[PDB]
Design an enzyme around this catalytic site. Structure first.
Site, PDB file in Angstrom:
ATOM      1  N   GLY A  28      13.882   8.239  -1.083  1.00  0.00           N
ATOM      2  CA  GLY A  28      12.846   7.279  -1.336  1.00  0.00           C
ATOM      3  C   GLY A  28      12.960   6.662  -2.706  1.00  0.00           C
ATOM      4  O   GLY A  28      13.873   6.931  -3.489  1.00  0.00           O
ATOM      5  N   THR A  29      11.975   5.812  -2.987  1.00  0.00           N
ATOM      6  CA  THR A  29      11.778   5.184  -4.280  1.00  0.00           C
ATOM      7  C   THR A  29      11.218   6.225  -5.241  1.00  0.00           C
ATOM      8  O   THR A  29      10.626   7.222  -4.829  1.00  0.00           O
ATOM      9  CB  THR A  29      10.852   3.948  -4.161  1.00  0.00           C
ATOM     10  OG1 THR A  29       9.761   4.212  -3.268  1.00  0.00           O
ATOM     11  CG2 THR A  29      11.617   2.690  -3.711  1.00  0.00           C
ATOM     12  N   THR A  30      11.499   6.041  -6.522  1.00  0.00           N
ATOM     13  CA  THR A  30      10.889   6.875  -7.556  1.00  0.00           C
ATOM     14  C   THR A  30       9.370   6.607  -7.620  1.00  0.00           C
ATOM     15  O   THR A  30       8.959   5.445  -7.549  1.00  0.00           O
ATOM     16  CB  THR A  30      11.557   6.575  -8.915  1.00  0.00           C
ATOM     17  OG1 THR A  30      12.988   6.656  -8.810  1.00  0.00           O
ATOM     18  CG2 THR A  30      11.102   7.532  -9.997  1.00  0.00           C
ATOM     19  N   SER A  73       6.419   8.361  -1.606  1.00  0.00           N
ATOM     20  CA  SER A  73       7.821   8.086  -1.552  1.00  0.00           C
ATOM     21  C   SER A  73       8.352   8.741  -0.289  1.00  0.00           C
ATOM     22  O   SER A  73       7.733   9.734   0.217  1.00  0.00           O
ATOM     23  CB  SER A  73       8.562   8.698  -2.730  1.00  0.00           C
ATOM     24  OG  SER A  73       8.090   8.103  -3.923  1.00  0.00           O
ATOM     25  N   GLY A 160      10.853  11.294  -5.388  1.00  0.00           N
ATOM     26  CA  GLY A 160      11.797  10.189  -5.310  1.00  0.00           C
ATOM     27  C   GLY A 160      13.152  10.571  -5.873  1.00  0.00           C
ATOM     28  O   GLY A 160      13.378  11.703  -6.304  1.00  0.00           O
TER      29      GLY A 160
END
Lengths: 242, 244, 212, 204, 236, 195, 222, 249, 244
Positions: A28-30, A73, A160
């Site tokens: 995922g994204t941070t 995330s 993330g």
């Protein structure tokens, strides 16, 4: 063997499938959450994968009740489905007891649900970590919820790809402040440690989103950070890493 | 493999059982269909196998309603479920509105039944494990767009056609349609066209106890032609093969 | 309200009025009480206006559904007993029903059945149902014959509704005549009760209590 | 009216010593009309005897209901059912229909076959165990019977002193009631033989 | 429950139907012949074993109406489910429509059970293939149908189902004209017996004949009656 | 209440029912059967409360015939009346009480003895040698109890039935417009044109 | 104790033309002797040349309109842009009525428009279901003041040609849209004077295939 | 979804149901238990074993009361007995104390509990309880009776029996020691002696659990003043009492 | 996985035959011999227990003979456990028919009912069939005494003499050579025992391992009286046949 479902269990005392799902969150994204004295300042990396995107219009931040921010995330649909479930739960509490749902209480309800899908074979385990918290009459709180269905109180949390980068800096931030810091100053620090956690994401370019729930600025209501205040935070972080 | 599940995708990108449904049309006794603006004709083969079959009570021609006809070709265990549903749907429209149902709308309803594979997908009740195995040539006349011919898949997809042939001999039929379809056909010239394409994919002597013609006409309604008329038309085709 | 139907040799004459009221006051003078169930079946409206019409529309839905399934046209016995069971259910839930289903066929002849809200299915060669059925009966059955002409049958249908209009407060309006044959129903037009009265008074010599 | 006292019917039962007796009238009617004089209310499962009064359809439906249950018991334990276990069963089955209640009065009369002890019990409409060791009477002219049986009886009668008192008590109540009488049958129930004796009674 | 049992085959088939048809092969053998005034359904009984009463053994042709009979090929267990179900439809059709069942109504019904259990996950179709024959009220026309465990039905003039139905059907082709059914009752019964005398044999102890004639006339002919037709066939 | 008389004789059962149909205050039909064969040797006539009667007679006809065809055996009159009693007992509890009074007359072949039953709408089966329902039954019971001898013939019972109908015409203010008469005997179910 | 029905009065009038139709109605809403609202038309265009007014008890009447205009949407979506008939409209409204027939509505409903022949068509409904084609039908509370007068000027009911003395009836006329507007305005003005549930405004809707026109006229305040 | 409704019991190809063979193995991993029926009582006995030496075995019950005159004892798995004994109590009360208002016969109760086992071999999401129970009791209709309940869901009456992993040894011991007429006192002495050869723990009354369904006790009934009513036929013996009988062998 | 652990045992095999039904017949050959012989004056049911031990109480054991109603009893060959559920369903059904028709259930109907339950397990639910075989002794007045076997597929076959369980073939050859159509109950009692003596499952046949029951029309007034003998009354008949 021992991953074909989640009613399999190994002689290792582990569930494999559930450990595997934590790897989706690692993709995922941070996202970070700083527990402050008087609130919480969340921030999340929103990648610019194309200049086709429309900035600060795709939120990963959905509010629950009025004072609990939730940001996540991992698999974005699965976390939005998790937060949809918990918005129904927030409403039920408000119905029955005529008060906004507390942060420890909201955590417990989410935790049972995610915990349930790692027992049933008819419903698929989660692949989200959510970072959520807020301000109620029992203080500021910060909670991180694993897809395994675990949570704790936190003085700092992250998830993330860039959770490494965030966490290391929060250690130093807890060494800067051995009780914590103001929500106002943590706007500038949430940006700062997102900008260091974009060194595993400096292949791309990103749009900085920050949201907060703090007693001292927003009166313990969950609102978005933006405008002149957001740009001050951006300028802070830009100068720090240069 | 991927046919042991009900909704389980395969690297393909599309359902495997659904492919098998398309390959269950190739077990059906050919149903051929020519649409023009003078009415639409549906013909069908029956498939004699014995002098002990009663074939003039067997047909793959079906009435859905007064103004809509249908021919089915493929697994006919499946087609019984779909035809009964088509019959209700038409009658429901006439209950609710006192009005004729469009050929497009009627077909679309039958495609909704065709999508009922799964046993745990969405909210809507699943009354099957798999897909059907039969395609339809729902012809008709509505007073909006006139005469219409639709070909409905067991997929849950439908196309409007001007001519379509389904069944075992479908590819060999479809080759003849490309070269033999035109806009200046008549009702009767269309009717002889059916038998021409049917004769090639017939495995027997083309006659009137193993072929059935049917029309849908505005002013006559849906009429299933009697074997006397079928026998006549068959003989006149041989006279136009006595022209070559 | 008065609806009647009578068998004879020619088939069934269906004859009905067209006055419908709401309260003491006359709502309408052009409300048809004949529901064409299909091209071979007629139904008459008596009982609840709502209930009768709805269910005879639905009966024709089920009529088409028998006809496609068997490939042969429905039995009239079969039609009446489809409607009956369903109303019997709404027995103790309050529906109002009275229809005569009229049909002529090739395997039982002309047949009339009377369906009730209680769920009755009565065979009979005659029924008069409505609020003016007592005045319809009197004149109809005195002049009744199984041996009857089709022309004469239309005049007897007229005359029974005309009697009912005279005495009953809710009856009148106009007369609609249909002759159901084996080939299906033929419509013989609408004849105003208001002009019918003075013509018949001159012609027959009837209604000599009325001033004139 | 009351659907218990619409068809009437009456049952008397008395204890003796080494005997019990139950008796009923044969009159079964609907309202004012007498329908039959050919209807017995006494049934028996083993050495237990069941008399049942009140509403007609409930008389006959409960007769076959208790037959359903005792068959199961008998096949299972492979022994006759006792008067005491039958009471408990009757009490529980009447209480099943508490709402939309049964409209009867069952009467249990037998002899305990493991002590030789005469045993009777009564039930009402919702059903409750009504122990006594003198008499149990149920029905509509039960009221009448309560006075009549009290007056005649003196504890632990002989089988034939028992038959003389029990015969009287029924007949005088039964012709003193419109929906009872019209004949009578008396079972004299010993440990070993049951005599069934009809009474000549005046046709009322 | 919903775990699929009917799974799509790579032939454009369903696995449970192919197996049902193998089951009809293991089954018994029912033969159907329509005359110009009769239907005749004769069937194979399995009673080769000695000391077996034949008064109380279930019959292989069971009467659903007064002139519509139901006969079967395949498993002996599963056939009974369609038979009990057909009787409920018979009493429902008389309640709500009036008039005895037609053969055609019952042909559609029996197919709707097989068809419903073929498409759904949780039920398998019965391994029973059926012949529905008889008369329709106010018709002296014999109707002869076959339904199969697919849920498909087709008309016939004469038919055979079950074990070595190929062999028997070939014999019946030459001794049967579509245009001209047996105009005699006797020759129709003799035709069904000859067909049975290929596979069934055993004298007449596995041979049954039920003859149905119009006017609500179903007759069952025992082993004793059937012998009479056999000797005539031997002389012939 | 429509006429429904039963008279059990000693080689048959003779049932009779009213032809008149009355709904409201108007006679709609004056010739209509109100009886239906349950079995080839059991007959049920029905009267009671309009329209309940019609439905439940075709319902019971279906039920008994379901068993009779399934096993190829016909149920005894005793068994048939018990089944009908069961439904009626249940139906008064039910949402809509059913008011159906029926005389089920049948010739027992099992015991080779005629049997006649009177079943009220409550659901109580009683065997009698004669029966009735409605108010009309009130006048005929005394006649039947006067003239019944236990060695009856079919023709004596027909003659007694004519008396019952004449008395009925005088004392009942209702017209029933003659009765249909049917015999349930060991030879089938037949009609007689005597009334 | 609760009674979930009431009355909110009002009055309507629907006239079938020969290439037009007019559905008109008052804009006054009342409950008994109180005036609820001066202006609030109950006569709605529903689109596609069909106008519907469900008049009487307002809550029921509103519900019917909401669901009916939903049905207009679902007719184009699910029947593939089929244009709504007056015929098709009528039966669909009858299903919404017979449904709550055991928990009855209490409106008198009228639709108007053109049928696909290109003439006016009016169907009027009783409060549980069933409808029949009429030429002129009124509804609402003042219905029976407006009705006989409209029949006398439209259908020429109980009129005769001069000097024939009830021997030759004055035949049915040819109507024009203009003419009928005059009759509507005359009748409602009388109604305001002789009935109290009528007044404040009048809105006459004209339907043709050239468009739908809304035209407002005032009435008295009394 | 949750499509487990298919049985987890299935026939094996050489006959016999595989799942209950597996459960029968679980009985032979469990403790040992036995029952000797006397003519004036029944004695039942089992061995107590603990997961820790810090676990109390004075709070450990493997002999449980179903009804006052009827006791049960298990061999097999602890967990599987623990739920199933509750269900045995439950069905005695729902179906004979709410219908027949009394405690069920020993024959009757044993049959009902086999129905509960039988539906744990039917359908998914269940598997049979892997215990055999001895149900010793007294009823007033069949006398004393001693039963063995199988994880099959079958039962058999016995005169003396054993279950557990040391069952074969125990019943061969009991073969010589059973007589047509027995005293309850002698029955106890045989019971402890038989179980001495099948217990690898202590043989003190602390670790040997002893219970009789011998003669009834009206001073444990909890009320007095109806002579007619009888008290518990069961009596659990506490540890000191069991020691007295060990010296009396 | 809620289909990954399902094996599908309600399916046919390529033969047309159910796996679990075939296996059940094997597991019933484990249980001991059970015999039914139909004389004319009654039916003899005789079964030898499949377990014996000397500390086993066999004087109260019911493990083969069970009464469903006062004229119908069954012998069990298979699992006791499996049979029990069907035995109590049988009791309910027999009494249900008595409750509603006030007439005892004929033998035909009851046998058909239990068979439907067995077929029902393979038809749906994914359930295994109870592997039971019953030999039904039943009386009705319409066919007199009726004898039946039902198998775990749910099918019933009429018989004159029949055996299930252990040594089914051996037992049957003994019945075939020794049977008369004019046998009494006495003759059938001796035949049953002598057949069990050659199909014995120890080396000696003993009274205490036998359940023996008859249904006799000797009982006055035309009643049928079922008597299940005590082992001490079976002993008497074991001396009659001179095994002892």
């Amino acid at each position: 063997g021992y991953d074909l479902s989640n009613s399999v269990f190994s002689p290792d005392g582990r569930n494999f499938q559930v450990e595997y799902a934590v790897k989706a969150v690692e993709n995922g994204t941070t996202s970070i959450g700083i527990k402050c004295n008087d609130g919480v300042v969340f921030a999340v990396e929103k990648l610019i994968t194309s200049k086709l995107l429309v900035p600060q219009k795709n939120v990963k931040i959905q509010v629950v009740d009025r004072h609990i921010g939730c940001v996540y995330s991992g698999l974005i649909p699965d976390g939005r489905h998790l937060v949809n479930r918990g918005r129904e739960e927030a409403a039920s509490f408000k119905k029955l007891y005529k008060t906004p749902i507390p942060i420890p209480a909201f955590a417990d309800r989410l935790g049972q649900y995610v915990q349930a899908h790692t027992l049933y074979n008819s419903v698929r385990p989660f692949g989200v970590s959510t970072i959520f918290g807020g301000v109620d009459k029992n203080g500021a709180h910060l909670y991180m919820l694993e897809p395994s269905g675990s949570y704790w109180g936190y003085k700092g949390a992250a998830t993330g790809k860039g959770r490494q980068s965030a966490k290391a800096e929060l250690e130093k931030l807890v060494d800067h402040h051995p009780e914590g810091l103001s929500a106002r100053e943590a706007v500038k620090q949430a940006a700062k440690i997102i900008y260091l956690a974009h060194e595993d994401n400096k292949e791309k370019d990103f749009e900085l989103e920050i949201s907060w729930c703090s007693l001292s600025e927003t009166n313990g209501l969950h609102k978005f950070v933006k405008g002149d205040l957001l740009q001050e935070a951006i300028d802070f972080a830009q100068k720090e890493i240069n | 493999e991927y046919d042991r599940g009900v909704s389980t995708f395969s690297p393909e990108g599309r359902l495997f059982q659904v492919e098998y449904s398309l390959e269950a049309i190739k077990l059906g006794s050919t149903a051929i269909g020519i649409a023009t603006k003078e009415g639409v004709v549906l013909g069908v083969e029956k498939r004699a196998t014995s002098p002990l079959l009663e074939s003039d009570s067997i047909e793959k021609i079906v009435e859905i309603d007064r103004h809509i006809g249908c021919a089915m070709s493929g697994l006919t265990a499946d087609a019984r479920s779909m035809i009964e549903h088509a019959r209700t749907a038409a009658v429901t429209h006439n209950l609710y509105y006192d009005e004729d149902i469009n050929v497009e709308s009627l077909t679309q309803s039958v495609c909704d039944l065709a999508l009922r594979f799964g046993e745990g997908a969405s909210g809507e009740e699943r009354l099957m494990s798999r897909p059907f195995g039969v395609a339809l040539l729902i012809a008709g006349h509505d007073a909006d767009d006139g005469y219409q011919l639709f070909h409905a898949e067991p997929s849950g997809t439908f196309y409007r056609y001007n001519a379509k042939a389904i069944g075992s001999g479908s590819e060999g039929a479809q080759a003849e349609l490309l070269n033999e379809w035109h806009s200046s056909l008549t009702l009767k010239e269309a009717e002889l066209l059916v038998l021409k394409i049917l004769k090639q994919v017939m495995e027997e002597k083309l006659d009137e106890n193993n072929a059935q013609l049917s029309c849908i006409t505005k002013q006559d309604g849906f009429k299933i032609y009697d074997n006397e008329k079928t026998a006549e038309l068959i003989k006149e085709l041989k006279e136009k093969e006595a022209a070559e | 309200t008065t609806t009647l139907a009578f068998r004879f040799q020619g088939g069934i004459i269906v004859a009905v009025d067209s006055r419908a009221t709401a309260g003491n006051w006359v709502a309408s003078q052009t409300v048809k009480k004949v529901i064409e169930i299909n091209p071979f079946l007629l139904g008459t409206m008596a009982g609840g206006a709502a209930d009768c019409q709805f269910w005879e529309t639905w009966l024709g839905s089920q009529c088409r559904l028998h006809e496609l399934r068997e490939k042969e046209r429905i039995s009239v016995a079969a039609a009446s007993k489809i409607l009956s069971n369903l109303v019997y259910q709404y027995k103790g839930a309050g529906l109002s029903m009275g229809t005569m289903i009229c049909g002529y066929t090739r395997k039982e002849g002309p047949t009339i059945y009377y369906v009730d809200s209680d769920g009755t299915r009565l065979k009979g060669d005659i029924f008069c149902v409505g609020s003016g059925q007592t005045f319809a009966y009197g004149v109809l059955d005195s002049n009744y014959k199984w041996d009857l002409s089709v022309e004469d049958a239309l005049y007897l249908g007229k005359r029974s509704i005309l009697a009912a209009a005279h005495r009953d407060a809710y009856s009148g309006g106009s007369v609609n005549l249909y002759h159901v044959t084996e080939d299906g129903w033929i419509y013989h037009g609408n004849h105003d009760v208001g002009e019918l009265f003075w013509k018949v008074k001159e012609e027959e010599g009837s209604f000599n209590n009325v001033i004139g | 009216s009351d659907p218990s006292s619409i068809n009437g019917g009456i049952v008397v039962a008395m204890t003796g010593k080494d005997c019990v007796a139950i008796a009923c009238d044969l009159r079964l009617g609907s309202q004012s009309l007498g329908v039959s004089n050919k209807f017995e209310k006494i049934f028996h499962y083993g050495h237990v005897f069941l008399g049942i009064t009140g509403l007609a359809t409930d008389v006959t439906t409960l007769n076959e209901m208790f037959r359903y249950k005792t068959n199961l018991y008998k096949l299972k334990e492979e022994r006759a059912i006792e008067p005491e276990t039958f009471t408990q069963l009757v009490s529980s089955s009447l209480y099943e229909r508490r709402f939309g209640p049964y409209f009867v009065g069952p009467v249990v009369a037998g002899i305990n076959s493991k002590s030789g002890k005469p045993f009777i019990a009564g039930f009402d409409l919702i059903g409750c165990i009504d122990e006594a060791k003198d008499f149990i009477v149920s029905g509509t002219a039960s009221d009448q019977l309560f006075g009549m049986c009290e007056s005649l009886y003196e504890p632990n009668l002989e089988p034939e002193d028992l038959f003389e008192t029990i015969s009287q008590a029924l007949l005088n109540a039964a012709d003193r009631d419109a929906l009872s009488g019209w004949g009578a049958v008396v079972y004299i129930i010993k440990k070993d033989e049951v005599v069934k004796r009809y009474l000549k009674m005046r046709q009322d | 429950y919903d775990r699929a049992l009917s799974i799509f085959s790579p032939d454009g088939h369903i696995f449970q139907v192919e197996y049902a048809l193998e089951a009809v092969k293991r089954g018994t053998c029912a033969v159907g012949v329509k005359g110009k005034n009769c239907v005749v359904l004769g069937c194979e009984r399995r009673s080769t074993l000695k000391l077996q009463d034949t008064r109380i053994t279930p019959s292989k042709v069971s009467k659903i109406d007064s002139h519509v009979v139901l006969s079967f090929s395949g498993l002996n267990a599963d056939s009974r489910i369609l038979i009990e179900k057909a009787r409920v439809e018979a009493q429902s059709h008389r309640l709500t429509l009036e008039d005895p069942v037609t053969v055609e109504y019952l042909t559609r019904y029996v197919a709707g059970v097989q068809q419903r259990y073929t498409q759904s996950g949780g039920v398998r179709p019965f391994g029973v293939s059926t012949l529905i024959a008889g008369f329709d009220p106010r018709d002296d026309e014999p109707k002869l149908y076959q339904t199969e465990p697919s849920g498909i039905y087709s008309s016939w003039s004469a038919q055979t189902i079950g074990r070595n139905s190929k062999t028997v059907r070939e014999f019946l082709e030459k001794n049967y004209d579509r245009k001209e059914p047996p105009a005699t009752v006797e020759e129709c019964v003799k035709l069904t017996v000859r067909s049975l005398l290929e596979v069934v044999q055993t004298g007449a102890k596995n041979i049954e004949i039920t003859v149905v004639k119009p006017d609500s006339d179903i007759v069952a002919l025992s082993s004793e009656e059937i012998n009479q037709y056999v000797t005539q066939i031997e002389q012939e | 209440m429509d006429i429904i008389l039963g008279i059990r004789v000693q080689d048959s059962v003779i049932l009779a029912s009213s032809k008149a149909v009355t709904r409201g205050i108007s006679v709609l039909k004056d010739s209509d059967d109100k009886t239906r064969q349950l079995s080839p040797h059991t007959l049920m006539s029905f009267a009671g409360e309009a329209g309940d009667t019609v439905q439940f007679a075709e319902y019971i006809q279906a039920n008994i015939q379901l068993y009779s065809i399934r096993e190829d055996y016909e149920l005894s009159p005793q068994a048939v009346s018990s089944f009908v009693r069961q439904e009626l007992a249940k139906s008064i509890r039910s949402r809509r009480p059913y008011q159906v009074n029926v005389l089920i007359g049948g010739y027992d072949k099992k015991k080779n003895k005629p049997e006649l039953y009177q079943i009220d709408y409550l659901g109580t089966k009683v065997e009698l040698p004669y029966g009735a329902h409605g108010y009309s039954g009130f006048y005929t019971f005394s006649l039947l109890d006067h003239h019944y001898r236990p060695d009856m013939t079919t023709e004596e019972g027909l003659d007694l039935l004519k008396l019952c109908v004449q008395e009925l015409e005088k004392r009942m203010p209702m017209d029933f417009k003659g009765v249909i008469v049917k015999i349930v005997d060991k030879d089938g179910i037949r009609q007689v044109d005597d009334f | 104790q609760f009674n979930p029905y009431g009355d909110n009065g009002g009055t309507i009038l629907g006239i079938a033309g020969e290439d037009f139709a007019v559905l008109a109605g008052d804009t006054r809403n009342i409950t008994d002797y109180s005036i609820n609202s001066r202006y609030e038309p109950k006569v709605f265009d529903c689109g596609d040349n069909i106008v519907m007014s469900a008049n009487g008890f307002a809550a029921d009447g509103d519900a019917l309109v909401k669901r009916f205009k939903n049905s207009v949407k679902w007719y184009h979506f699910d029947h593939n842009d089929k244009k709504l008939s007056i015929n098709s409209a009528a039966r669909n409204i009858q299903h919404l009525l017979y449904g709550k027939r055991f928990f009855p509505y209490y409106v008198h409903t009228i639709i108007a428009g053109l049928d696909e022949d290109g003439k006016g068509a009016v169907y009027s409904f009783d409060p549980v279901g069933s409808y029949e084609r009429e030429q002129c039908r009124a509804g609402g509370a003042a219905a029976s003041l407006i009705m006989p007068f409209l029949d006398n000027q439209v259908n020429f009911k109980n009129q005769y040609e001069p000097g024939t003395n009830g021997k030759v009836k004055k035949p049915l006329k040819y109507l024009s849209v203009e003419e009928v507007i005059k009759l509507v305005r005359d009748s409602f003005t009388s109604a305001t004077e002789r009935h109290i549930q009528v007044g404040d405004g009048l809105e006459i809707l004209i339907v043709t295939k050239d468009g739908v026109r809304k035209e407002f006229y005032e009435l008295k305040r009394d | 979804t949750d499509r487990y409704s298919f049985s987890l019991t299935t026939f094996s190809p050489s006959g016999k149901l595989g799942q209950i063979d597996y459960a029968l193995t679980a009985v032979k991993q469990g403790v040992t238990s036995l029952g000797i029926k006397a003519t004036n009582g029944v004695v039942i006995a089992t061995e107590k074993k603990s997961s820790s030496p810090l676990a109390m075995s004075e709070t450990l019950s493997k002999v449980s009361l179903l009804t006052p005159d009827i006791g049960a004892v298990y061999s097999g798995m602890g967990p599987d007995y623990r739920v199933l004994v509750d269900k045995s109590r439950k069905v005695a009360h729902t179906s004979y104390k709410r219908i027949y208002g009394e405690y069920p016969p020993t024959k009757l109760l044993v049959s009902e509990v086999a129905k509960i086992m039988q539906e744990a071999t039917q359908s998914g999401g269940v598997r049979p309880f892997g215990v055999s129970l001895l149900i010793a009791g007294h009823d007033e209709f069949n006398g004393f009776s001693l039963y063995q309940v199988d994880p099959s869901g079958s039962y058999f009456p016995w005169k003396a029996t054993a279950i557990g992993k040391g069952s074969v040894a125990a019943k061969t011991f009991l073969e010589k020691r059973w007589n047509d007429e027995l005293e309850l006192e002698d029955a106890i002495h045989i019971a402890l002696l038989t179980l001495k050869e099948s217990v690898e723990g202590e043989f003190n009354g602390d670790t040997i659990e002893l219970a009789i369904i011998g003669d009834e006790n009206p001073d444990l009934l909890g009320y007095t003043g109806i002579p007619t009513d009888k008290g518990p036929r069961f009596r659990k013996l506490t540890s000191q009492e069991i020691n007295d009988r060990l010296e009396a062998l | 996985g809620s289909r990954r652990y399902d094996s599908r045992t309600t399916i046919f095999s390529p033969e047309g035959r159910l796996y679990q039904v075939e296996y059940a017949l094997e597991s019933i050959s484990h249980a001991g011999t059970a015999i039914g012989i139909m004389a004319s004056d009654g039916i003899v049911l005789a079964a030898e227990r499949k377990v014996t031990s000397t500390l086993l109480e066999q004087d109260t054991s019911t493990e083969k003979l069970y009464k469903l109603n006062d004229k119908i009893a069954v012998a069990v060959a298979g699992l006791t456990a499996d049979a029990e559920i069907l035995i109590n369903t049988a009791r309910i059904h027999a009494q249900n028919y008595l409750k509603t028709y006030n007439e005892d259930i004929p033998v035909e109907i009851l046998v058909r009912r239990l068979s439907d339950i067995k077929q029902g397990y393979t038809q749906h639910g994914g359930l295994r069939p109870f592997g039971v075989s019953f030999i039904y002794a039943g009386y009705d007045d319409r066919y007199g005494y009726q004898l039946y076997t039902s198998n775990p597929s749910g099918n019933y076959t009429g018989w004159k003499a029949i055996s299930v369980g252990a040594n089914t073939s051996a037992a049957q050859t003994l019945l075939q050579m020794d049977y008369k159509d004019d046998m009494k109950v006495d003759d059938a009692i001796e035949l049953a025992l002598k057949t069990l003596s050659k199909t014995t499952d120890s080396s000696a046949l003993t009274y205490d391992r036998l359940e023996f029951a008859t249904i006799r029309k000797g009982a006055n007034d035309g009643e049928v009286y079922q008597k299940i003998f005590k082992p001490q009354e079976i002993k008497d008949i074991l001396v009659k046949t001179g095994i002892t």
